[PDB]
Write a protein that binds this ligand. Structure first.
Ligand SMILES: Nc1ncnc2c1ncn2[C@@H]1O[C@H](COP(=O)(O)OP(=O)(O)O)[C@@H](O)[C@H]1O
Ligand SMILES: [Mn+2]
Ligand SMILES: [Mn+2]
Ligand SMILES: [Zn+2]
Lengths: 410, 91, 478
């Protein structure tokens, strides 16, 4: 190809705290609209914000997990705009002086092998509410208003629709691994906004940028980008100039579309929120979070290859879906036959659970039961053929392998 | 200062100015802006913006606090429906 | 005659059962009925409700057991309207208590009404109440000051003994001066701003009006301390001010800023202030000239900062969750812009326009940011002057109470009322306005600005001054 795709992404990750960012209302999915609510998050007259400590602690854990420099001083700014799901007229985030800066995420590619996407910033902000349209009216649930979010911004380092997806997947996995957000786009805990230009290959200056807002799955971002890149390429070789705008993506058509409303944005009138003193983060606290950091995926991936002699294909499976690795490790602990357990987990148990629709967190076969089953295969008590028969029923029922060996004879 | 200026700032601020206000605010503000231009004279390179003295950023444990009763929370609403605030549709 | 009695007199009567809370309220109620038609201190009188609340009031040893207290109508009292004297908030029923109201209620106090003000605390005369002017009980052709106009006035006529206002740039002190009453704005952070409708978050403070220094010291002590619902409230112990005002500290020093000599004063005010200082000199205060090289910049600084924070704090009045909403609109933009144009008064609209400009990118550095830096220079002048001196004195106001319509022609003329009051708010310092003379029938206030957290000294000097000069005995309407 003559061109090159330059992709940058803007992710808003919802932090898994119990409490909102600036008040003690609960964060929880579901239900009753305007239920977990406040003078404060309702942006009522006279209501003041108060910083959630965990949100901060999770926002630091996440920055570090992303190799960001965490700044000891950062400042909440007011970000002004009028919209029904924004109770105050402003959103409290961070502007100049964000929490974290100069980080990076590492990608593992089908094969260029190994690549880096830089994190431009990670800032702390609060969420808006949701709107529902119904007739000539919009209905506003401010339950989600004020929810803690990390806004994460990438450098234009991504080059490929797939890399865009691989990025989001890895980001998700770190978040989950650090345990700061559930980060499933399905549940509304990860939003992503896409920025795309093209150059001609090897040129060092940037092309006109299009923004694609509100794509809702990792698959959809890849698709949106896939189309959009072809779209711009068409425009440029036809002799036209690619116009800088926002666009939208229809899942059903797989296409990206300009907007009827010709609405330019407005000055956010940023300035520090005088209801809040600057966030001073002690170095001792960072060190403490750094020292007690959970195990991250890139580290887990190397540890398993060593501690259990798994293959890069085996460990990948187990690390990308954390709960499987968690399962695997509890099982190997019951019976230290690692090669055997991974075989029966990947080749057998996983496929069987997928077929019912049951996730590994909730499987009837507990790590104990698989380690037990594998044990009878090693100690030659049953055959591989019968082992494959008792596993189908282990899942079918919930019984131990040695329950059904007896019950059916051997 | 121009009519265009008064409108642009009103738009940002969401005040549909009445024609009487566009004339009156053209003068008053033009004056007020001349009235407050007194600070150039002063040198503030090497001066820190004002903030009150704190030692530590005051924070707050992650523990739920009883929300506002939904009833009180909507009672002042200009229009309510089914637990929701209602507004004209947004596009 | 009961409403003519101080809180010490009322408390002793209440503690020994000689009077009941209900009688106390009834007394002030009648005085309200005497005066209100002329004065117009209140937006929402609550004597009726207070009457009922008094019947259930029993524990007499509560610090404010049976005391009526008026409250500015930008402080939320739950179940009752909080209008901020605005069309955009008439019919807004307050869903929660401001922290100060909570603390007063717990102290046995009885909220007797919601007091008139300039709309959104924005003004220096109360003329910008969207409902009606309050009038000066010493001359009803004259303004009572602002923005806490009603709170000062009702304390002057004694339709309530003691009062709550707020002070962003002098909105307790200047009404105190004009109405011939004591009014204190404490250190920034000393009193919670939870439930105070925000004007300028970094300048606002709730404060107290009274006629006796002990009244003021007590109400301030109660309403006082750290509040977990307020990030900017300080984790500092509240001094026992009721036990402290009566004490006397030797060899205190008073600074007179050289730069204030250049300030245009009315001769009567000048004369009043000179006498105030001579008389304090006689009592053993050392009087020193100090320098505050940046103070003259106070007013420009304030009138960038205040309107900026105000445009931000007022973005929430939008017709969506509460308050006024315009009747005619074709789209949510019109709903917004019409609700606001119709619901906001003219002074509020002026500061909103100014604010959104001062915060606009391209002008932010030269306006808001600049101002916040000049503010530090200003603060520093004070800190340095406090190395040599213990309090700083000046007139509270450059003029005697002025006439209605006198400062409505050019909005700037209204701003110039604040020249002596704003520096305290910029620096975050406590300041008190104290009645020092009556000149041509009209109150004159003397101002003392103290060090951070030194409300004590401010109160002590106010207590000593009232012994020499018993302003609490002047009552306006018969
Ligand atoms: N020419 C471009 N092509 C692709 N992405 C870009 C380009 N310029 C900026 N971006 C991306 O846009 C995202 C958001 O940029 P940001 O500066 O936060 O918002 P804005 O540019 O609107 O102020 C970042 O991911 C950045 O990498
Ligand atoms: Mn954002
Ligand atoms: Mn963008
Ligand atoms: Zn809340």
């Amino acid at each position: 190809e003559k061109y090159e795709a330059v992709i940058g992404l803007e992710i808003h990750v919802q932090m898994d705290t119990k409490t909102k960012m600036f008040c003690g209302c609960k964060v929880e999915f579901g239900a009753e609209p305007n239920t977990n609510v406040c003078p404060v998050c309702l942006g009522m007259p006279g209501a003041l914000p108060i910083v959630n400590k965990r949100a901060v602690e999770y926002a630091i854990r996440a920055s570090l997990a992303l190799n960001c420099e965490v700044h000891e001083e950062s400042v909440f700014a007011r970000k002004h705009y009028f919209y029904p799901d924004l109770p105050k007229g402003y959103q409290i985030s961070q502007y100049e002086k964000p929490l974290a800066t100069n980080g990076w995420v590492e990608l593992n590619l089908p094969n260029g092998e190994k690549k880096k996407v830089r994190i431009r910033r990670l800032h702390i902000e609060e969420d808006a509410g949701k709107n529902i349209h119904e007739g000539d009216k919009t209905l506003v649930d401010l339950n989600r208003a004020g929810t803690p979010l990390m806004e994460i911004v990438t450098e234009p380092d991504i080059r490929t629709p797939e890399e865009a997806r691989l990025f989001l997947e890895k980001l998700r996995n770190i978040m989950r691994y650090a345990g700061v957000s559930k980060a499933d786009m399905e549940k509304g805990q990860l939003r992503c906004d896409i920025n795309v230009s093209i150059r001609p290959k090897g040129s060092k200056e940037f092309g006109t940028r299009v923004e694609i807002k509100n794509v809702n799955s990792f698959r959809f971002v890849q698709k949106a980008l896939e189309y959009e890149i072809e779209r711009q390429i068409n425009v440029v070789e036809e002799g036209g100039e690619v116009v800088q705008e926002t666009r939208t993506f229809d899942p059903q058509t797989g296409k990206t579309y300009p907007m009827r409303t010709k609405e330019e944005a407005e000055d956010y009138r940023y300035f520090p929120d005088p209801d809040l003193v600057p966030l001073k983060v002690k170095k001792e606290w960072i060190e403490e979070i750094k020292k007690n950091m959970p195990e991250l995926p890139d580290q887990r991936f190397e540890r398993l290859i060593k501690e259990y002699g798994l293959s890069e294909y085996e460990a990948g499976i187990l690390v990308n879906h954390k709960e499987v690795g968690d399962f695997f490790e509890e099982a190997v602990r019951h019976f230290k036959e690692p090669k055997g357990i991974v075989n029966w987990l990947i080749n057998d148990l996983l496929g069987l659970l997928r077929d019912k629709g049951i996730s590994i967190e909730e499987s009837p076969v507990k790590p104990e039961h698989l380690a037990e089953l594998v044990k009878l295969i090693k100690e030659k008590v049953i055959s591989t053929k019968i082992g494959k028969e008792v596993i189908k029923e282990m899942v079918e029922t919930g019984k131990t392998p040695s329950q059904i060996v007896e019950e059916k004879g051997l | 200062v121009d009519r265009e200026w008064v409108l642009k700032i009103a738009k940002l601020a969401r005040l549909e100015l009445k024609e009487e206000e566009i004339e009156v605010f053209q003068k008053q503000l033009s004056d007020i802006l001349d009235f407050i231009d007194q600070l150039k004279e002063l040198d503030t390179e090497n001066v820190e913006p004002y903030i009150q003295e704190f030692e530590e950023t005051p924070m707050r444990e992650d523990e739920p606090h009883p929300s506002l009763d939904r009833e009180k929370a909507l009672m002042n609403a200009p229009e309510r429906k089914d637990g929701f605030f209602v507004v004209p549709r947004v596009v | 005659m009961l409403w003519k009695k101080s809180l010490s007199e009322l408390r002793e009567l209440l503690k020994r059962g000689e009077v009941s809370p209900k009688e106390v309220v009834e007394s002030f109620y009648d005085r309200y009925n005497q005066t209100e038609e002329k004065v117009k201190a209140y937006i929402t009188p609550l004597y009726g409700k207070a009457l009922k609340q008094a019947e259930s009031l029993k524990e007499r040893e509560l610090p404010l057991f049976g005391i009526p207290i008026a409250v500015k109508d930008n402080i939320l009292v739950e179940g009752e309207k909080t209008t901020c004297a605005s069309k955009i908030l008439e019919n807004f029923v307050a869903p929660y208590d401001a922290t100060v109201i909570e603390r007063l209620k717990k102290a046995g106090a009885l909220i007797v009404g919601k007091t008139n003000l300039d709309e959104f605390a924005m003004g220096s005369s109360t003329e910008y109440s969207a409902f009606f002017p309050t009038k000066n009980p010493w001359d009803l052709e004259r303004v009572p000051g602002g923005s806490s106009g009603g709170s000062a006035a009702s304390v002057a006529v004694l339709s309530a003994p003691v009062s709550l206002g707020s002070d962003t740039g002098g909105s307790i002190r200047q009404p105190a001066s004009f109405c011939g009453v004591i009014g204190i704005k404490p250190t920034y952070g000393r009193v919670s701003r939870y439930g105070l409708v925000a004007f300028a978050s970094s300048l606002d403070q709730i404060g107290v009006f009274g006629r006796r220094t002990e009244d003021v010291a007590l109400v301030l002590e109660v309403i006082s301390g750290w509040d977990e619902k307020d990030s900017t409230s300080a984790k500092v112990p509240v001094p026992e001010w009721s036990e402290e005002v009566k004490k006397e500290v030797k060899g205190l020093k008073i600074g007179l800023p050289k730069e204030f000599f250049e300030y245009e004063l009315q001769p009567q005010v000048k004369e009043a202030f000179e006498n105030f200082i001579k008389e304090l000199e006689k009592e053993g205060f050392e009087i020193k000239e100090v320098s505050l090289p940046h103070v003259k910049y106070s007013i420009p600084t304030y009138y960038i900062i205040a309107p900026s924070e105000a445009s931000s704090n007022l973005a929430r009045y939008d017709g969506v969750r509460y308050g006024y909403r315009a009747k005619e609109y074709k789209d949510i933009f019109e709903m917004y812009a019409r609700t606001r144009d119709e619901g906001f008064g003219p002074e509020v609209k002026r500061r909103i326009m100014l604010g959104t400009f001062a915060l606009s990118a391209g002008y932010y550095d030269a306006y808001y940011l600049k101002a916040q830096k000049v503010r530090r220079l200003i603060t520093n002048d004070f800190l340095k002057a406090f190395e040599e001196v213990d309090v700083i004195a000046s007139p509270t106001t450059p003029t005697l109470p002025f006439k209605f319509g006198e400062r409505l022609e050019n909005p700037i003329e209204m701003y110039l009322s604040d020249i002596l009051t704003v520096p305290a708010n910029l620096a975050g310092l406590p300041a008190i306005s104290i009645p020092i003379a009556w000149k041509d029938g009209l109150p004159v206030g003397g101002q003392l600005i103290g060090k951070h957290w030194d409300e004590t000294t401010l109160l002590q000097i106010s207590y000593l001054w009232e012994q020499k000069f018993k302003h609490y005995e002047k009552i306006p309407l018969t």
